[PDB]
Amino acid sequence: MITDCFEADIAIPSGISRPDAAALQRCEGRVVFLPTIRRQLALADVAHESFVSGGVSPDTLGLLLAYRRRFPAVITRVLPTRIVACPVDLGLTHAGTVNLRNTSPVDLCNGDPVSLVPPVFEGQATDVRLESLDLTLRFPVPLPTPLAREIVARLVARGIRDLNDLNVLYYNGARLSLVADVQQLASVNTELRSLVLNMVYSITEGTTLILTLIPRLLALSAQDGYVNALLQMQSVTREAAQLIHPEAPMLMQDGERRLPLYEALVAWLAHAGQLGDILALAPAVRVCTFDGAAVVQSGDMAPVIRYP
Amino acid sequence: MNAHFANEVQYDLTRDPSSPASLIHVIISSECLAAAGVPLSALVRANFRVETQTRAHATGDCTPWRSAFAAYVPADAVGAILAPVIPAHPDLLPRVPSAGGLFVSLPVACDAQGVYDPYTVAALRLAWGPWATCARVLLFSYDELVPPNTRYAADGARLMRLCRHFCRYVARLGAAAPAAATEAAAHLSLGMPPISPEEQLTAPGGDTATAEDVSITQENEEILALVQRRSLVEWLDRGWEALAGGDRPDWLWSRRSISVVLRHHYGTKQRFVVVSYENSVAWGGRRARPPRLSSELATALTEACAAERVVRPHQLSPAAQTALLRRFPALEGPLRHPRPVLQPFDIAAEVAFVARIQIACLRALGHSIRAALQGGPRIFQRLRYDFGPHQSEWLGEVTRRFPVLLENLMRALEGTAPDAFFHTAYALAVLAHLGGQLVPLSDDIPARFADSDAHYAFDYYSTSGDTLRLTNRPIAVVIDEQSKCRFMEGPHRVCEQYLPGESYAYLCLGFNRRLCGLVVFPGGFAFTINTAAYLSLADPVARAVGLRFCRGAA
Numbered sequence A: 001m002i003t004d005c006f007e008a009d010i011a012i013p014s015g016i017s018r019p020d021a022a023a024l025q026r027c028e029g030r031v032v033f034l035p036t037i038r039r040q041l042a043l044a045d046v047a048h049e050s051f052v053s054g055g056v057s058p059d060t061l062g063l064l065l066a067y068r069r070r071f072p073a074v075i076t077r078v079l080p081t082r083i084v085a086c087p088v089d090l091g092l093t094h095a096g097t098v099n100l101r102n103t104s105p106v107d108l109c110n111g112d113p114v115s116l117v118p119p120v121f122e123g124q125a126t127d128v129r130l131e132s133l134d135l136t137l138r139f140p141v142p143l144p145t146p147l148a149r150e151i152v153a154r155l156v157a158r159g160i161r162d163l164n165d166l167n168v169l170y171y172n173g174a175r176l177s178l179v180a181d182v183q184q185l186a187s188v189n190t191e192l193r194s195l196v197l198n199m200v201y202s203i204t205e206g207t208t209l210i211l212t213l214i215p216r217l218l219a220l221s222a223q224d225g226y227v228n229a230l231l232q233m234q235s236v237t238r239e240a241a242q243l244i245h246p247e248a249p250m251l252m253q254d255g256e257r258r259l260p261l262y263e264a265l266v267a268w269l270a271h272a273g274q275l276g277d278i279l280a281l282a283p284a285v286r287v288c289t290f291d292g293a294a295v296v297q298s299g300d301m302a303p304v305i306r307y308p
Numbered sequence B: 001m002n003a004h005f006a007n008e009v010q011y012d013l014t015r016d017p018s019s020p021a022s023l024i025h026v027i028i029s030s031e032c033l034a035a036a037g038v039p040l041s042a043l044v045r046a047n048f049r050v051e052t053q054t055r056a057h058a059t060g061d062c063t064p065w066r067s068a069f070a071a072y073v074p075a076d077a078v079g080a081i082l083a084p085v086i087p088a089h090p091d092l093l094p095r096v097p098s099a100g101g102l103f104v105s106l107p108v109a110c111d112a113q114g115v116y117d118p119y120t121v122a123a124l125r126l127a128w129g130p131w132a133t134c135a136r137v138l139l140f141s142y143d144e145l146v147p148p149n150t151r152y153a154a155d156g157a158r159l160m161r162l163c164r165h166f167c168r169y170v171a172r173l174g175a176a177a178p179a180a181a182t183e184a185a186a187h188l189s190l191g192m193p194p195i196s197p198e199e200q201l202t203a204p205g206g207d208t209a210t211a212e213d214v215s216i217t218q219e220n221e222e223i224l225a226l227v228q229r230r231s232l233v234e235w236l237d238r239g240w241e242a243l244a245g246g247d248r249p250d251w252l253w254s255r256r257s258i259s260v261v262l263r264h265h266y267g268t269k270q271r272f273v274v275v276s277y278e279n280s281v282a283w284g285g286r287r288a289r290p291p292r293l294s295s296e297l298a299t300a301l302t303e304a305c306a307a308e309r310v311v312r313p314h315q316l317s318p319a320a321q322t323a324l325l326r327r328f329p330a331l332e333g334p335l336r337h338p339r340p341v342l343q344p345f346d347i348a349a350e351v352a353f354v355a356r357i358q359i360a361c362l363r364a365l366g367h368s369i370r371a372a373l374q375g376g377p378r379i380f381q382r383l384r385y386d387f388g389p390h391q392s393e394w395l396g397e398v399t400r401r402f403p404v405l406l407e408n409l410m411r412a413l414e415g416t417a418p419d420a421f422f423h424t425a426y427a428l429a430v431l432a433h434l435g436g437q438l439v440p441l442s443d444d445i446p447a448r449f450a451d452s453d454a455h456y457a458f459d460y461y462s463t464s465g466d467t468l469r470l471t472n473r474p475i476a477v478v479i480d481e482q483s484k485c486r487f488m489e490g491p492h493r494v495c496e497q498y499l500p501g502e503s504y505a506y507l508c509l510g511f512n513r514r515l516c517g518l519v520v521f522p523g524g525f526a527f528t529i530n531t532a533a534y535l536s537l538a539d540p541v542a543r544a545v546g547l548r549f550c551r552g553a554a
Helices: A145-161 A185-200 A208-211 A212-221 A225-230 A261-273 A275-279 B003-012 B030-034 B040-044 B077-082 B153-174 B179-191 B196-201 B211-228 B232-242 B249-254 B296-308 B318-327 B331-338 B348-371 B391-417 B425-436 B539-549
Strands: A008-011 A032-034 A040-042 A069-080 A082-087 A100-101 A114-115 A129-130 A135-137 A140-145 A168-171 A172-178 A285-287 A301-307 B021-028 B049-054 B066-072 B104-111 B121-123 B139-141 B257-266 B271-277 B456-461 B505-510 B516-520 B526-532
Touching: A032 A082, A032 A275, A040 A145, A069 A100, A114 A145, A114 A285, A140 A145, A140 B153, A145 A168, A145 A185, A145 A275, A208 A261, A261 A275, A275 B318, A285 B249, B003 B021, B003 B104, B003 B249, B021 B030, B030 B040, B030 B271, B077 B196, B077 B257, B077 B271, B104 B121, B153 B179, B153 B232, B153 B257, B179 B211, B179 B232, B196 B257, B196 B391, B296 B318, B318 B331, B348 B425, B348 B526, B391 B456, B391 B505, B425 B456
Parallel strands: A008 A040
Antiparallel strands: A008 A082, A032 A069, A069 A082, A100 A301, A114 A140, A129 A135, A168 A172, A285 A301, B021 B104, B021 B271, B049 B066, B049 B121, B066 B104, B121 B139, B257 B271, B456 B505, B505 B516, B516 B526
């Protein structure tokens, strides 16, 4: 119960109005960013006034950047005197199953990892405010990982337009758009530096062999409908072959003992497939409904089994 | 094989480009190395390191030594190129056995409109160990190295044997053969005698313009005619990949054309095979960067005195001498230099550079030897030893035996080969002394030899019978009137357990960084000699000698 559960206890103060206190009874399946793993904390360390720096509360793209400096935890039960949350990383429960709540507009599936994202969507940024205490609780949004990478991708691309539309998405035929918002340039700089260092290190000498195969793909996309759909209608490589004639050098330095493409894959995987984990946080949570259904709708709870 | 691949990767740094250069893949034979003073067994004990530098025609400085790659094969070298052997299946390609040696591609100094100066020298070095006795240096001329024309002609018939050998080898292996191999056999047979590498050496053929060789045929075959009125290579490339399990790029060029040009080594009279692959970026390769090597300098220099029936360009009239100068501004150096450090437009001129230095060093002794010994002296002893009553009778023999040795030293010192002389303790003191006015090569000098004038170097000589040099490695001893002595920090030489002049049957000779000589006879009786006074050399010679025999310090 130290290893199985871990009851990190957020204390509730004395003076809270009964309309504000009963507003916390609808805060069941949430995500609370614990700074440490103390067994006794306060709402001020949980609320957004803990998140704010000196004079500056950052934007949504920066609001990711101190989630991953903290410990996400899910509220287990809202008592009148305290709020109990088990941290995700240490131990889930006795049996190891906690319930979240879809504050998403998006329906989940079983077995898919669930990433939690700041409130970026339109008509969605709902922060339960304590009027009796002047505290806001910016509850993040649990999302599917095929969305939660694109939503980070639209925000990072929006900041780099602003250094010289984009905020519209789709998911299973549901049109949805996120909040267009001005971004602090200090937040964009650590993001853009995190792109390039994972992009420069992802290039190896054997990748020039792969580059030669680009006109073979357009020779292949004229016959395979799978390749014709794979590239895109607006892909770069379809445009990067009509102006580009790639070639490989003849010999390799010590090219007898080393593998050109096998070294190309491992350096690619360690930096380019790894790159989505560095932008967002890791989806350490998936949903395994035991007996309910295969699709978990919005507003409903969902059972959670930890995710390696 | 791989030694040429690895070097071309180095030549891909285009070097600078500001000074244009080229590269020539060379296969030295073993018998050319054997005659070069190279023990063959020592190399066998998979690349090998070699230092190279280029040396100017007449006057100038040599390139600083640079490390290249070498791989020695104690087998047929040309055969390994020609008939690569699958590790799993040896019997796939039968071939004629031959000899071989290391593979080194060599740099070639080019120009804008690249033309090599013949008689200019490129140099190797071979280190079997730290000390200079384990180091040899071989020389080559751009005339020697660069053949006028290549041959891809004789290599053509070779490939059809492969298409026959694969088709023949699979037919034996039959059912056991992997299906992909049997497949390629079908096509390769539709495209359709052991392999002897020495054919391509003696083959009378090479590449040609062949333009009029097409038009010769159409005015031939119409004569005649009017009287009347997936390549195979990819299957071969898939032939190995069936029986190999890997691409093995070393083999891929072996399946292509291979240009084998037989050459001869002016030094050893022996043979070394220049090779240029088909895809090779170096000289002779079908893929090469312009400008390429031209004979413009060389061809004229032959007919300049040939049309004059003259042996030497300096016996050529200065009118024709200036004639080629107008075309070729680089020939000023050898022709117009008043006192060329090297005899211009010669071959052995470089050797004359060495041998005169040999003489220059000797007289720096005999005149200095005569100096201190001139009027009959009393040497006493600069060392410390105790003598027994019976040992005195021995010392009595040292008196009578004393003058004969002093002859025999300078006898042998003169008699030494000029090459090997430069490994001796005295030649190292010179290369150390002139350097003092760097690190002499082979690191023969101890690190503290530059500390005090007390640090010395030594050789030993047999007192009885033939007088010889008993010490490969010059021995370093520090001295401190009498003062004791001690060795320095570090196969076995029994001569090294003794101090100089400590025992009978050792003549102990030494020098200094200051180059103040010391001659130590048995019994410890020894006198100083300062040979720096009588040593006389030109600074342009001294600086040119060092850059060959020493290295820029680390």
